[PDB]
Amino acid sequence: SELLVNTKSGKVMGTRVPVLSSHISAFLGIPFAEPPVGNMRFRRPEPKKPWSGVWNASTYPNNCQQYVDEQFPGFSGSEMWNPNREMSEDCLYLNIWVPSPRPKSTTVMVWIYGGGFYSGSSTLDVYNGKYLAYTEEVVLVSLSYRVGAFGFLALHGSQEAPGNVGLLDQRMALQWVHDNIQFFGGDPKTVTIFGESAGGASVGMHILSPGSRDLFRRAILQSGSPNCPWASVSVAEGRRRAVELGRNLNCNLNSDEELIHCLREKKPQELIDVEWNVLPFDSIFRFSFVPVIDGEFFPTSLESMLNSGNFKKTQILLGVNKDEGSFFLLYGAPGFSKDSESKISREDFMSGVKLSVPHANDLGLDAVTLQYTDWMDDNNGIKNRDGLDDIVGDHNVICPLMHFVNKYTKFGNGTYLYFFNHRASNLVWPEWMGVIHGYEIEFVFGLPLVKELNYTAEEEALSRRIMHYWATFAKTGNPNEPHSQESKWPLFTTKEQKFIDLNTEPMKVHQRLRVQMCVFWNQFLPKLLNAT
Amino acid sequence: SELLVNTKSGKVMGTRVPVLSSHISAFLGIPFAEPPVGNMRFRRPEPKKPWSGVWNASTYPNNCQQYVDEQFPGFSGSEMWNPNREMSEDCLYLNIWVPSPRPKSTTVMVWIYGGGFYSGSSTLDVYNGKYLAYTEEVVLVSLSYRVGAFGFLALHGSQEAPGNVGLLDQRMALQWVHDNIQFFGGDPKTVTIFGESAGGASVGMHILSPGSRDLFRRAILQSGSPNCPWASVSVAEGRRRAVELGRNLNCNLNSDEELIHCLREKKPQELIDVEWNVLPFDSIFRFSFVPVIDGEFFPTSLESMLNSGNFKKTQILLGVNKDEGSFFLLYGAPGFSKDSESKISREDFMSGVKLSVPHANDLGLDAVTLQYTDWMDDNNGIKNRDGLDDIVGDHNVICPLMHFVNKYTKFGNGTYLYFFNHRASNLVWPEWMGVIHGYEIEFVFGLPLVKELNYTAEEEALSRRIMHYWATFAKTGNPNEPHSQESKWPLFTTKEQKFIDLNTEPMKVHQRLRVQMCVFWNQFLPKLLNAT
Ligand SMILES: *[C@@H]1O[C@H](CO)[C@@H](O[C@@H]2O[C@H](CO)[C@@H](O[C@@H]3O[C@H](CO)[C@@H](O)[C@H](O[C@H]4O[C@H](CO)[C@@H](O)[C@H](O)[C@@H]4O)[C@@H]3O)[C@H](O)[C@H]2NC(C)=O)[C@H](O)[C@H]1NC(C)=O
Ligand SMILES: *[C@@H]1O[C@H](CO)[C@@H](O[C@@H]2O[C@H](CO)[C@@H](O[C@@H]3O[C@H](CO)[C@@H](O)[C@H](O[C@H]4O[C@H](CO)[C@@H](O)[C@H](O)[C@@H]4O)[C@@H]3O)[C@H](O)[C@H]2NC(C)=O)[C@H](O)[C@H]1NC(C)=O
């Protein structure tokens, strides 16, 4: 049968799924590691002990234990991101969508979910790999990994909670793909990893980590980069938070051995309930448990690694959305709300700024405010709203991504850069939020092809055009077809720094993506804070 | 006779001078103080001992001892600013242009020359008071004052060189006008002081100094303000330079009494020859001997005086030219020259910046460079040239003037603000220099009325229009005629900060003159340098 597959872990049985007047195969919830339960909460993952018999992979696995957004109960725009299955600590599985008939040795795409390292699910509707699998004849995998404290509690020195274990979950799934994807028609030497937000940063982290580089061929990074200020902490900061988490559960803090035991005794919701109370600053776009710079997974600081060329040299394709900041301002900044235009008083602007740049002193906060205020018109509430949207997006996503790109491009084998600025016609979030963190994903996964979802024709076109760039790039390391008669996404070079915007208009090429602001965030502001 | 006049100092005899198909009276070189020669070099001025007999005031007096520009020997554009009479330490005189027939009690305008407190002459062609006297039926006075070390060597504590004595020369001339101008038809209670550059700052200084406030009624400040960073130093900095000047003439530096004696023994050119070698920084738009903040002439710091309202409350009219920086860049910055377009390499830009902001550390220099560089286009030599022109103008003239205006306007009785941006059609300096420091003066003094000088008709019109604003303002404290049917120069208010541009176009009103840059120079940058 097309749906029975023998792998080095055991036989698996998939399921035939419909997709756009046709059908394909899917293998859902295949285990790649031992459950990380009990005395193994916080531990490195162990490889899954192989099974005799037939693993029923006809239905999605559990999502990992995570915080669940109840800010807009019922609202599709927010629930679409929440777990759609029972949560459990038993959650390390992957899902595979394979063309029909099964190919022999086609391109593989492995999706790594975002969600700030504290949430995410491999099983969400907007991550359904079938439209991509089917339209580009690729094998589309999506893995899962432990988020929150479960994935990222770091007590450096201990082996019981060494930190980074969620990145190790991802790595193990990548090992498994390397070792088994051929049984499904996949070419293990044309594996592309791709990801959004923390997934984007994850991908970049796998490019940096020596122990992950050999497991894949190329990378796509969407709206995330491993050097993002939210994406990692020092081992000391990790420790501080591990401990501080202890204190909120009246735990014994006298040794690592003592704390971890105490933390392992707790129910999962008891950890989720107090996870946000360990952040050292009142802040947005900061997350409690995240990768740590340990000297194991990351042998030195990211910045030193990037200067010296210590990373996988290959092709990458990456970029950003127009209004990355809006989602976090909505959820965490005073003045902003879903059902108004959220025009913003001076006073709430300055509140915004302090929240957006938490590590900054008063001189720093002034420098940021000077950069982003039109002083001819300092009480326009649209301008203050839009200016804060830009501050958050620039500081957290765009400028760090641009810094990664420029450093990568000195040593790599080709870089392709996009700026996604299309607001979907059927978006249910308000207009002021613009082109939002995460809303390119649905184009990448082909959802505008499903008539019932109410995209325009131009939007179906753009999705097809993007699915092709992604798949073609994953196949050849270039998103352009060889001699096509459409216009060419130029390569990004150190000298000229070209990129394209992705939307329904005729493709347009520009150069030096947000360079004015990024010189501020990447050169000036850091200098300013070092001196003071 | 119309040309014989009895004053409290003696009888004076003027001279009938032609002006535009008519004639008027002029009294040139009337002494207002004892020569400041010998044991009186560096001293407070003493009032001129009255004379019996008739003082021949038919010809211009000597100009004061000053440095003489030989950068462009023969070139009209530069020689027009140099002394046109024998220089001497005997130089404290004034000049008076009176309508024919002599009026009884008309408005008086007293001009104070600029030239960085180190040069200037009351007798230059471009300061000929006759066109104004005649066209607006005002009595136009122009005084003179000691520049350089002669005017400004400050050894606080000594009475032999107390500093500020050149400002005291101006004050004495103003005393004399107060006491005698009525004999010439002048109304001593409608005296307007007006000045450019250091003269502008002088005027503002007379508004601040309690001992000068009662001697005049209103003020016009052109491209200068008493808070300009070049316009004054502390008594310690004054001392340091007084001394350092000693050292360059192998003077005995053991006491004030010893140094001054030694400095009084020297010929004037011996002081001029080494005057520039005492500046503490390599710099432009900085001048060696300038007013000092002494607690006598200025009872406290300018900034504290301005916050507390300690100054003359009256009407003022003031403003700036478009390209104030260009003249100093030409004369003192590498890359810039008279006969090319002076496009400017990155490397010469950064040299520019260091020169323009001499008191600044490296973090400061970065902050300035960030503010003024288009990072999309960081090798456009026109943009780097123009950006440096703006840095110098903004930091030295515009932003300090704007800070003065906003502080004055909280406590004063009306403020009128202009932005002069007309490039004269017959300018002999190159185009890149733009609208240059000092080149509104010729409009204010009516030179575009003389056919032989080659102004267009539109330029004659603008000059008439400006002469009228100045004279009407000096007469009533408002530059507008009561019910005229031309458009009104609005008042500058704290709330709305309106100003007009002065040129050949239809008058246009705007608001918040260079406010983006001036928040940088007046708030951010000073904070930045205090913290570091
Ligand atoms: C991604 O990586 C691959 C390689 O890992 C890379 O392809 C390489 O491109 C260069 C282009 O310079 C090729 O180098 C040349 O190859 C020719 C033909 O064999 C040689 O004759 C060349 O030497 C002559 O010409 C040079 C002028 O170009 C002279 O400088 C020289 O003195 C000789 O006269 C030269 O070695 C190279 O062959 C390929 N390699 C492969 C495997 O194709 C590709 O460019 C990379 N892409 C990016 C975007 O970084
Ligand atoms: C694609 O576009 C179409 C057309 O624009 C769109 O169809 C709309 O879908 C919603 C489904 O949510 C329909 O709204 C419901 O209509 C019924 C009958 O009149 C009401 O009872 C419903 O109200 C209940 O639920 C509300 C919460 O939403 C409660 O507030 C309320 O108290 C009730 O319990 C509800 O309004 C809507 O009528 C259609 N419109 C049309 C013209 O068909 C479709 O959803 C789009 N598809 C996608 C996937 O977005």
Ligand SMILES: N[C@@H](Cc1c[nH]c2ccccc12)C(=O)NCCCCCCNc1c2c(nc3cc(Cl)ccc13)CCCC2
């Ligand atoms: N946690 C609170 C504040 C808080 C602080 N302490 C707490 C204690 C208990 C409960 C809450 C708190 C807070 O500010 N949460 C913001 C994060 C909510 C998670 C939703 C993540 N889902 C999204 C995600 C993405 N985009 C989104 C866009 C919008 Cl418009 C909305 C949601 C998106 C893209 C990546 C995947 C997740």
Ligand SMILES: N[C@@H](Cc1c[nH]c2ccccc12)C(=O)NCCCCCCNc1c2c(nc3cc(Cl)ccc13)CCCC2
């Ligand atoms: N003194 C040298 C450098 C120097 C340093 N050390 C020295 C030693 C000896 C000789 C020279 C030096 C220097 O940079 N000088 C610049 C000042 C020259 C004075 C001319 C002042 N005249 C002007 C003045 C004004 N505008 C001008 C516009 C232009 Cl384009 C040209 C001249 C203008 C307006 C106010 C009146 C004076």
Ligand SMILES: *[C@@H]1O[C@H](CO[C@@H]2O[C@@H](C)[C@@H](O)[C@@H](O)[C@@H]2O)[C@@H](O)[C@H](O)[C@H]1NC(C)=O
């Ligand atoms: C495999 O399982 C399919 C769906 O599983 C569903 O959930 C599990 C936990 C059970 O409760 C099961 O009864 C549910 O159906 C079944 O539809 C399918 O029949 C099973 N197939 C095979 C080959 O065993």
